[PDB]
């Protein structure tokens, strides 16, 4: 097939795809394997009661420093997604010399808690 799909991006950044307004904005309560495949990580295939991903995951999609680091605590029933708590790169703030007037040391609108414990 004629199709050279050269997707060159290393996502080694504290709030770009991982947490600017994209993983909070998606708002999907549907599948465990879909949210972990779209981020870039395995999931939990139990057919009884497949509950939370509360783990320090890591993906070697970088080639400059080390890895894209995923401390992402996300709660599941078996497939359906309840809530997600993202301390993955835990300071989302370029306090740094950049051509952008960014007077706000947290690049994201909200958390992702709902009305439910687990």
Reconstruct the topology from this structure.
Blueprint: H1 32-39, E1 53-59, E2 68-76, E3 81-86
Antiparallel strand pairs: 1-2, 2-3
List descriptors.
118 residues; Beta-lactamase Inhibitory Protein, Chain:B, domain 1; 3-stranded antiparallel sheet; 7% helix
Q: What would you note in describing this structure?
A:
The chain has 118 residues and is mainly beta. The protein has a domain of 77 residues: Beta-lactamase Inhibitory Protein, Chain:B, domain 1, CATH 3.30.1450. 7% of the residues lie in helices and 19% in strands. The chain has one helix and three strands; from the N terminus they run αβββ. The chain has a three-stranded antiparallel beta sheet, with no helix packed on it. A hairpin with a 4-residue loop joins β2 and β3. The radius of gyration is 16 Å and the shape is globular. It starts with 31 loop residues before the first helix and ends in a 32-residue tail after the last strand. The relative contact order is 0.23.
Tally of individual helices:
1
The main pleated sheet reads as:
3 strands, antiparallel
* Name given to the CATH architecture of the domain at 21-97: 2-Layer Sandwich
Percent of residues in helical segments?
A: under 10%
Which radius of gyration do the C-alpha atoms yield?
Answer: 16 Å
The best one-word shape is: globular
């Amino acid at each position: 097939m004629a199709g050279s799909g050269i997707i060159y991006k290393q996502p080694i950044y504290q709030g770009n795809l991982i947490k600017q307004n994209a993983v909070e904005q998606l708002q999907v309560g549907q599948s465990k394997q879909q949210v972990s495949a779209l981020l870039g990580t395995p999931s939990i295939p139990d057919p009884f009661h497949a509950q939370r991903w509360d783990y320090t995951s890591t993906q070697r999609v970088d080639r400059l420093a080390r890895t894209e680091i995923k401390n992402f605590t996300v709660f599941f029933e078996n497939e359906q997604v309840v809530r997600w708590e993202g301390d993955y790169f835990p300071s989302q703030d370029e306090q740094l010399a950049k051509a952008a007037p960014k007077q706000f040391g947290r690049n994201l609108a909200r958390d992702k808690k709902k009305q439910r414990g687990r």
